[PDB]
Amino acid sequence: TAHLSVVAEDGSAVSATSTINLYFGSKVRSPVSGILFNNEMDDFSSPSITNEFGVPPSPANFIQPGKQPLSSMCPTIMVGQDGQVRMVVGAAGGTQITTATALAIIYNLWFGYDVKRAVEEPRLHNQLLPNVTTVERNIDQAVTAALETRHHHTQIASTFIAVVQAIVRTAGGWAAASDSRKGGEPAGY
């Protein structure tokens, strides 16, 4: 998955999230065209496949011909009451997309972190099933302690949690950030 955020000089914006699903998709590359084909069928539930201990397959998300599988993607644009874009945000990272997008928004909108900090700040994730909270390796360990004393069991992410690209309007113009977790950088004028 990849997320891109764009604001043009006229104030119009695009938040776009695109995916072939797993790394390298289906692992089927055309030798002629070079196209690397998605494995988006894996995002459906299947009655015969248990994905997680104790978790039933979801019937709302079974395969039918012509159906689209449920996605965690959530490319978002926040607009102020005056009609000007405030934030363009989204994320990559499977089921961590939605929580990471929420966090980037919380971090900027409510905690008052600038856009680069909102992107770089450590994240955490819980999706109910499975029943664990995943935290990034550099999270404030007072947060880990606060979670554990409230009976959450935590685990540290082996790599990182999601990839966020964001733009926020400031007094100075359009502030942009790409996530160091994946290595991007923005550009503009």
């Binding site: 119009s12 289906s26 196209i35 979801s58 607009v79 009609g83 939605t98």
Partner: protein
């Protein structure tokens, strides 16, 4: 510190070269949509593990003149020959031709460009055709993905053909070229989206998917449509509106997380001491747990009736009912949050 502030316009992509390509499209008079497409075509090269013309996408688009937002749905669909019981193991659903859904990417670019484009279609491809031919150093993200999937890549000659050197995956900094994709991008630039769906590329797409055990047919490609959504999901937060896609995407989940949390009136004070910060992050996790409990009823709204589910997930009053169940002192067992597998 690594901040980037622009007086006029900005592109935040996950590779610097693709951000620059988007920016150059803007500077040349492109719309935000033109820039997005040019950048996306580049990300499909530099982060080829992540996305590209073999996949699908969603776009959320805001027009500052009309003050209207729209969504373009170009996510992949299950082919006509698909059925509920087609897979019996994770391997079957994840690897090989049968795992392939009908790609939507290029029809999405086309619909977005028809509605909002300023630059010629071919101009959007030109910088990526050059990049794919000249090659580029493998970046951090792609290098880590290559390492993670080294075994499968190294044992598949058609992947090795582009992603290896001396029979081993490329490492960060080593040059990657994508010469066949460059040619495909050129065909798309010249012949348009129809080349992919009902034109010169189609038979080969079908041949490739079927050779790998799949069931995508020409009819599937011919019948694929991107979809314009004139009324995306929104929620009000303070003096702002947040536009996001509804089912089959996770706008309803995001909406519920934020609507639960908005009643706590978070501010900079919420993170100013360890006591406050700890409680704040606990509350965030509990909001996640409530929101994900509701997610299991979501699916493609053309196939599943999600009307009432989504109404609740986007209701501030419903969210207040959930926030009232968040205990400041403890988390709870799974059943507490009432995950439902049926309505």
């Amino acid at each position: 510190p690594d901040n980037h502030v622009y007086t006029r316009a900005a592109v935040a992509a996950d590779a610097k070269q693709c951000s620059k390509i988007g920016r150059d499209a803007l500077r040349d008079g492109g719309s935000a949509v033109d820039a997005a497409i040019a950048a996306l075509l580049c990300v499909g090269l530099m982060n080829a593990h992540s996305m590209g013309i073999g996949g699908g996408l969603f776009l959320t688009i805001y027009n500052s003149t009309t003050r209207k937002a729209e969504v373009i749905n170009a996510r992949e669909v299950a082919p006509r020959l698909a059925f509920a019981t087609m897979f019996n193991s994770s391997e079957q659903s994840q690897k090989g031709g049968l795992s392939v859904a009908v790609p939507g990417e290029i029809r999405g670019y086309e619909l977005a460009h028809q509605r909002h484009g300023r630059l010629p279609w071919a101009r959007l491809f030109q910088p990526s055709i050059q990049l794919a031919r000249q090659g580029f150093p493998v970046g951090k993200g792609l290098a880590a993905a290559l390492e993670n999937k080294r075994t499968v890549i190294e044992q598949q000659p058609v992947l090795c053909e582009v992603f290896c050197r001396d029979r081993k995956v490329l490492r960060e900094g080593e040059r990657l070229t994508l010469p066949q994709l460059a040619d495909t991008y050129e065909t798309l630039a010249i012949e348009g989206a129809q080349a992919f769906y009902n034109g010169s590329l189609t038979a080969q797409i079908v041949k490739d998917i079927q050779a790998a055990g799949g069931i995508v047919t020409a009819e599937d490609l011919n019948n694929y449509r991107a979809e314009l959504i004139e009324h995306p999901l929104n929620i009000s937060l303070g003096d702002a509106v947040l536009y996001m896609p509804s089912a089959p995407l996770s706008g309803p989940v995001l909406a519920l997380i934020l609507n639960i949390l908005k009643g706590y009136n978070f501010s900079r004070e919420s993170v100013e001491s360890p006591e406050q910060k700890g409680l704040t992050y606990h509350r965030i996790v509990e909001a996640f747990r409530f929101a994900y409990a509701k997610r299991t009823l979501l699916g493609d709204p053309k196939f599943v009736d999600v009307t009432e589910v989504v109404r609740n997930m986007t209701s501030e009053f419903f969210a207040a009912q959930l926030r009232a169940q968040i205990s400041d002192d403890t988390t709870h067992p799974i059943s507490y949050y009432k995950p439902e597998f049926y309505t």
